[PDB]
Amino acid sequence: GLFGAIAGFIENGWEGMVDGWYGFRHQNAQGTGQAADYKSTQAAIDQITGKLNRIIKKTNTEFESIESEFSEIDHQIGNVINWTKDSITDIWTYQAELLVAMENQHTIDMADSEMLNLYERVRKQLRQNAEEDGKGCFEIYHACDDSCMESIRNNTYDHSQYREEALLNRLN
Amino acid sequence: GLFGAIAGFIENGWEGMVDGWYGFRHQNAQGTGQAADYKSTQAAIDQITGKLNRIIKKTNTEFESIESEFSEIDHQIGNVINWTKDSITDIWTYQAELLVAMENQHTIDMADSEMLNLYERVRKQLRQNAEEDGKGCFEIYHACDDSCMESIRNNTYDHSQYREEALLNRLN
Amino acid sequence: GLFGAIAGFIENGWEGMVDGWYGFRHQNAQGTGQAADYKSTQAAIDQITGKLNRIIKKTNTEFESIESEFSEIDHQIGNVINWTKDSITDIWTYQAELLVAMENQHTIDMADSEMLNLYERVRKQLRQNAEEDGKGCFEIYHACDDSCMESIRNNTYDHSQYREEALLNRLN
Amino acid sequence: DPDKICLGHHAVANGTIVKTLTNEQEEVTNATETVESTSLNRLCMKGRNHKDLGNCHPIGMLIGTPACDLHLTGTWDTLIERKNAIAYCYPGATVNEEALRQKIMESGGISKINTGFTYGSSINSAGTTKACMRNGGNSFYAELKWLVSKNKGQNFPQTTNTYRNADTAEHLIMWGIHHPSSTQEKNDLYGTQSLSISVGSSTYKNNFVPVVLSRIDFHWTLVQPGDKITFSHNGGLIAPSRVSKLIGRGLGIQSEAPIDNSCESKCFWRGGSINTRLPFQNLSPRTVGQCPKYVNKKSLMLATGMRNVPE
Amino acid sequence: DPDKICLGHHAVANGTIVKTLTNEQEEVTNATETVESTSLNRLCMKGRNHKDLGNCHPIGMLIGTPACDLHLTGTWDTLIERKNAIAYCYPGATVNEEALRQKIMESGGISKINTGFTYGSSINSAGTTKACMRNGGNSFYAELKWLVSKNKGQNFPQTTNTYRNADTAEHLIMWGIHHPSSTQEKNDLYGTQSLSISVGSSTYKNNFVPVVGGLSRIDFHWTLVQPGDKITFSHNGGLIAPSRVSKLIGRGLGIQSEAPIDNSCESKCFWRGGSINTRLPFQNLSPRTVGQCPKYVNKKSLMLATGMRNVPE
Amino acid sequence: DPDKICLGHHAVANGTIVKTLTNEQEEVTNATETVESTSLNRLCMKGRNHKDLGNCHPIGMLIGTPACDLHLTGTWDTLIERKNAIAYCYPGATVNEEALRQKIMESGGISKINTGFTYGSSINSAGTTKACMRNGGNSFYAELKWLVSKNKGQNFPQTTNTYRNADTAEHLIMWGIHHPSSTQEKNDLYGTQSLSISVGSSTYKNNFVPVVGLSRIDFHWTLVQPGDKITFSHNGGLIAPSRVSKLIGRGLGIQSEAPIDNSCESKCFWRGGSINTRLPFQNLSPRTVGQCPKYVNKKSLMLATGMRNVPE
């Protein structure tokens, strides 16, 4: 897709993640774990909720009947009404198809961009202490316990604390 | 937003920047400075001007009166005209709302993309002489005077001149 | 443009590439070469084929005649028909202009995104063994023969094999 | 031996297909319908002062056909007309009939005002017919009067009747022209003289001549506040005893569906009611009220989630 | 020096200009047309049980003009009308003509039913004229009868003729009223007496009086006779009475065009100039089309981009 | 320790709210209105050969009512009708009135051609009335003639009048039918005989009979085709035309109460005045004429002309 993350450099989604749309899976000495990102999840959900508020509604225009159900209409006027109604139906059918096709394209790409923005946020956080593996993961070049993993997820990871250790492990 | 710069990793806009849409602020030994980027500003302005040219216009179709202002009309044909006018008005009201909502979404994301394209251009210029702080700035690892800052803004910065000095400062 | 590659950091297109939309050009001791990327080319073509399948069609609604070609029609109803037909034609003309303008914008930016996703894929393969030159090329800091170049294009380049040669060349 | 942190997104086992600009078969994590395909086979009349006319046709309310005796006056916000509803007991029809029906179906009520029209001793104003039965006896349209000669064969006298609209709103006045079957019948009821009915006001003028099986054709116009309408006639006029005032605004519905006072609805059609919150609808193009727009589509799924990329 | 690998895209020498949301002059590698500007100058009638009337006008099918002798009866899904088509051989015109023409062009066939009117020895029902020529000699409208007195100068008798609709669908009945040119011409055919025609059914009642004022003219009238209903013609000279009534069968596509027939090719969209067989969504030939058509737009061209930005070397 | 270069974007103190596909309350640096909600209460007629009829009704131009003496002939691209405009000085009305008024308001001018109708010695053709005052005393519809008997009580003779269309374009012919108030008046003007005004042509055919019951003159009309003749057979009751009309070309009909303004130009008009905007949409009225912005049910629709405003 447009931003290259969802159905892109991330190979597939996680069925195990049920408490969020985007999140993290880590690996260290203590073991493995999983956690959802609240901010990126709500950013996507609030944007979809906005679309629904705008699309799921009708006009308040009161329309009356111009065609009798139980008696014959004038033949001339009836043909004009039939031409007009079928023309109006073709416009609305076209507009409905275009609306939903356009919105679905935007919804998919919007969600893709939120995945990329979370990924880019973590990259700049880690700075020179990690390297990209190309699959949406960061190989971290220092000892990174559960509290250190939490600080990456919580956006309080200080790169300068581990920089000296990490640069030596990267150069090797 | 889609490209993650405006209302994203760049914390806020600059009210003090009055001569451009995008630009540079720097800090060195000498002091500080500010300057607007012309190329990115005009790229954003020209695209919006293009939208206004297409949107701010009316059709050349000549419409005549089908409803008398001062005399009566037959009630059936008056109802057919009223039904048709209300149907046409519902279409144009819907089209106007969709147009502006779609264009506003695109304008905001287009402007966001021009900010990111400028950011990416500067990242690649500096190469291995700087690092990203995550807030839209680049920490440059050599003495970078006003002439050197000007060369970054004007796209004439040569990374080779400062590479040995910069790499030593980065490794420490 | 939106993703900053086509008509952006890539200075121009290649008229010599007639076997694909996107591709590679290398330079090593053995010489120079050119090769198209099949996956990114088809991803762009399949999306444009999808647009054509949706756009290139008409409705199945049967419209009958409400205006006589060879004789006169009643004056009052003829005016209502003329107003209605001109209103419907203004709608469809407006819809056709908006459709084509919106789809052209998306097609152009979609093609730009596929270029960037190929560029970003190559960047992450090479990892710490190369650097970006700002013009869409990667300067590789190790001896990379035609088999090495083929492994970059075919997504089988293992960075860890060339890492020790590259880090020495980059740091001095 | 480096540690890892992996970014990722959710997925589901059972995804749903939606259409995009570039793809007909795009799988997403969730979606929702935008086209309503189901209708309630009932007229949802909760919160509506409604009138079910039943066997009464709207035009029958103004002239007073026996079927419409319980609907001669009233107020409403919704008026429901049924199939095969009776407007005319005696043979005939109204000129500009559909215009008149639509005008009644837009109203929010009907009230009646007496004309007070008087006729001399030479005229029998209480003419009745077997076609219009009321209480098991020969009767006539309740709001009209069949004027004929008291003595058979005698000339119907030259008569003048004027109604003034004393109200501050416009009144709807109706009358009929009897077109006799034969010359014998014409001479029996109205005499040998040549017949002519003139109706005139500020905003209206017309002349009627009875064509000489039998039929009473109806005509109508509006009398504005303060204006007078005059009837000049010498046989053939079916004169009004009362005129109508259409009060306010209301929603007209044509349907055979039964009424339900439990559910609410702002959109109606022949088949019933459409209560949906969705923007589009595929039941019928003929709807009334505040409705979702009709589309030629079974389904249009709107994506409410990202691309589903399963494991 | 380091080895290089460069990413890049294709391009062309001659690009094509398209419109986007932000740029009226955007060059792309290729584009395709969405508004059709060309038409085939033929009526493509393959897979259609069609009827080209030619010189016959639709109203002439009901009354039976000599030009419409092969179009009195038939079934069709498509009906083609032409310019300057002959409806009337004799001078005159139908009242409410356009509504009758439209109703016929919507139909999917016509069938005829006999009225069964028989006239006494005083009346001459085989009235003819040189205006309506058939098979070399003089003739009259095939579905009508010009009624005159057998003895010239004598009074036309008080005649009564009643058609009864025995079908379960409505029937279209047409008649004419002769308005003589001179009083001498009026007296020779219908006598000295004052003429008066009455036409009456349950949903119709009207009187028709001939008016005196080198041929005369016959003005036509029409109405619909409902199932189980009857229509009575009372008259004493002047009436051109129906020998047959019409029944419009089903529905069909009415086309008004000057283009010739072609049975080798198919189409679902037609106009005055011919057929439109394009796959494109829009079109700018004419706003007046019939069938399943592309939508008319006020545009010469609308190019849809089928490729990236063209950035040439 | 290290030097810095920072990338950023501009902002403003007072941003403006716009709607996007995804957000109702999106703040941007600048926006512009797409729906016009203000109108000039004046008819902007600059660069237009216009005719303000004033108190004259369009039908009055064809028949020649006193109020329409300045508008019997002319050319125009725009014709302006006003409220309570006078068509008939004498009581009465035209049959198929609205169709005629529409046809006149679509035209771009009018010219008059003489019928050349001559009458006998027993017909007084110069009948006038106090209802149609012109200059000082009694007068009549300029383009018509009230035909009555010269001697009071005598029978109006059986007259035949024929007009031939000698022009290449079609002509519009009008005539009236007097409907006397009483049988005494009937006898004084036209005599005791039974009246029958018959009108006939190739296209048109009709018969009229004066009903008896400060009187009335109802008008009728039809189109005479090029070359064709139209005949009038009558014996009293006919109000015959002295001239016929020819509608020249095409023009824009406006119905409005707003005053004229020859300084400003415009292409869109409504009852209240002119709509001069370059904006695509408009919420003033659904009844407009000319080349107009499309009516919408919206107070405002702000189009963004700038990025997201992220202040402070």
Ligand SMILES: CC(=O)N[C@@H]1[C@@H](O)[C@H](O[C@@H]2O[C@H](CO[C@]3(C(=O)O)C[C@H](O)[C@@H](NC(C)=O)[C@H]([C@H](O)[C@H](O)CO)O3)[C@H](O)[C@H](O)[C@H]2O)[C@@H](CO)O[C@H]1O
């Ligand atoms: C109309 C129809 O469908 N069929 C005709 C038969 O109705 C008709 O049969 C005769 O009808 C006579 C009707 O008598 C009244 C009535 O309608 O009740 C008696 C009323 O007092 C009289 N009212 C007034 C105000 O004049 C009324 C009126 O004159 C006529 O309806 C006007 O047309 O007539 C009666 O019952 C006879 O006994 C009955 O044979 C037959 C025979 O004429 O013809 C059908 O066409």
Ligand SMILES: CC(=O)N[C@H]1[C@H]([C@H](O)[C@H](O)CO)O[C@@](OC[C@H]2O[C@@H](O)[C@H](O)[C@@H](O)[C@H]2O)(C(=O)O)C[C@@H]1O
């Ligand atoms: C039914 C009938 O009477 N047919 C006549 C017909 C009619 O009488 C006539 O058309 C009614 O208007 O007239 C036919 O002759 C035409 C007639 O024209 C005169 O101008 C001329 O003076 C005559 O000699 C004669 O030609 C006709 O063919 O129309 C004869 C027909 O039998």
Ligand SMILES: CC(=O)N[C@H]1[C@H]([C@H](O)[C@H](O)CO)O[C@@](OC[C@H]2O[C@@H](O)[C@H](O)[C@@H](O)[C@H]2O)(C(=O)O)C[C@@H]1O
């Ligand atoms: C052509 C003609 O006869 N003009 C008369 C005119 C007509 O006779 C009349 O309008 C036909 O309805 O009448 C004029 O006098 C009107 C008449 O009105 C009475 O109420 C009044 O009592 C009389 O004194 C007289 O004014 C007219 O001006 O309308 C005279 C005109 O010559």
Ligand SMILES: *[C@@H]1O[C@H](CO)[C@@H](O[C@@H]2O[C@H](CO)[C@@H](O)[C@H](O)[C@H]2NC(C)=O)[C@H](O)[C@H]1NC(C)=O
């Ligand atoms: C206008 O369109 C309606 C709907 O297509 C037509 O009504 C149908 O008429 C056919 C007769 O050919 C019937 O078989 C259908 O049952 C009718 N459908 C409905 C929903 O009523 C109608 O005939 C058209 N009117 C005119 C004047 O052409």
Ligand SMILES: *[C@@H]1O[C@H](CO)[C@@H](O[C@@H]2O[C@H](CO)[C@@H](O)[C@H](O)[C@H]2NC(C)=O)[C@H](O)[C@H]1NC(C)=O
């Ligand atoms: C067509 O619509 C117009 C405008 O809504 C209707 O005119 C209004 O009628 C109501 C009466 O219910 C009045 O209160 C308004 O003052 C009228 N407004 C205007 C601008 O004229 C008109 O009645 C409708 N036509 C028909 C036949 O129903």
Ligand SMILES: *[C@@H]1O[C@H](CO)[C@@H](O)[C@H](O)[C@H]1NC(C)=O
């Ligand atoms: C309708 O439009 C056609 C084509 O422009 C025009 O010739 C015709 O006069 C119009 N109809 C009426 C009734 O004005």
Ligand SMILES: *[C@@H]1O[C@H](CO)[C@@H](O)[C@H](O)[C@H]1NC(C)=O
């Ligand atoms: C644009 O160019 C391509 C080149 O292969 C060709 O298919 C056609 O001319 C255009 N594309 C489409 C999809 O029509």
Ligand SMILES: [Ca+2]
């Ligand atoms: Ca209404």
Ligand SMILES: [Ca+2]
């Ligand atoms: Ca017109």
